[PDB]
DNA sequence: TGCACAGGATGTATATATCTGACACGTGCCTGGAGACTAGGGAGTAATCCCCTTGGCGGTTAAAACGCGGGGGACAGCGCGTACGTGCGTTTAAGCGGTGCTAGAGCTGTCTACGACCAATTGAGCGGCCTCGGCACCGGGATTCTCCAGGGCG
């Protein structure tokens, strides 16, 4: 369509000028990994203590 | 003389034959069950067109949203007294057993108006249209209507 056409180029006009696309930048948090593969020996240590 | 007893003279729950009421079982005539013919009403499709959306920038306005003062009205506390709450004896009248009736409730032939079912006309009622006089909104101005400050009065 021609509705498509200016409303798909807006998106872009809204970066060139400036990342307004949402800008949404990562504060770069560590890793989420919750195994902690010492904590499913605990149990073991428990018993052998 | 004061006293215990042996038997009659009354009660009383106890056990037995007896009187309603309701559940249980055996029928036969107006119901249902079912078989066939008709057919128009229901399931299915081919355009269609028509108002209803798609997505989001901005500019501006009217409506929504927040914020504080305090004024009056919701609301707690408390005393009063008369208006029902509670308890007696005394009365009028419904409950109930039983009775003589009837006049209106209730099931059944006759036919006869009289409304169900079906062609032919049309005209009064419905789709379409295009205006103007009543209607929408607001100024001008008079009128009322409430708000606040003495002050004459306690």
Same mark, same amino acid.
Do not use: G, W
């Given at each position: 369509?021609?509705?498509?056409?200016?409303?798909?180029?807006?998106?872009?006009?809204?970066?060139?000028?400036?990342?307004?696309?949402?800008? %949404?930048?990562?504060?770069?948090?560590?890793? %989420?990994?919750?195994?902690?593969?010492?904590?499913?020996?605990?149990? %073991?240590?428990?018993?052998?203590?």
């Amino acid at each position: 369509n021609f509705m498509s056409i200016v409303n798909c180029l807006m998106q872009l006009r809204k970066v060139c000028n400036h990342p307004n696309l949402f800008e %949404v930048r990562p504060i770069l948090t560590s890793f %989420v990994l919750e195994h902690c593969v010492a904590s499913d020996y605990k149990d %073991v240590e428990r018993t052998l203590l």
